[PDB]
């Protein structure tokens, strides 16, 4: 279901996505409570390893 649900939304009329480019602004070692809670506990404290990995 969610494979097809996701796919239909994607192929429905939408702005071009290959256009946009994801770029990271800041990486800091300070403890992150917002980031962690938002990613449901996984991947916290946006370190250096995490941007090449993700």
């Amino acid at each position: 279901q969610l494979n097809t649900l996701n796919k239909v939304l994607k192929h429905e009329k939408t702005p071009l996505f290959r256009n946009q480019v994801i770029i990271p602004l800041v990486l800091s070692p300070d403890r992150d409570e917002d980031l962690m809670r938002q990613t449901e506990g996984r991947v916290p404290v946006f370190s250096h390893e995490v941007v090449p990995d993700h």
Partner: protein, 47 residues
Amino acid sequence: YSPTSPSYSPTSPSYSPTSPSYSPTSPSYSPTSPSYSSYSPTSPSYS
């Protein structure tokens, strides 16, 4: 299984990498005259 760190790991080379050439050895500048007219992303854990 390990300390504060992204809770995810992958297959092998998220991206494969490469490298430059042997640096110790290389050429020279050989120039000529005009003729005649902050933080630290180091492994050491932060406090």
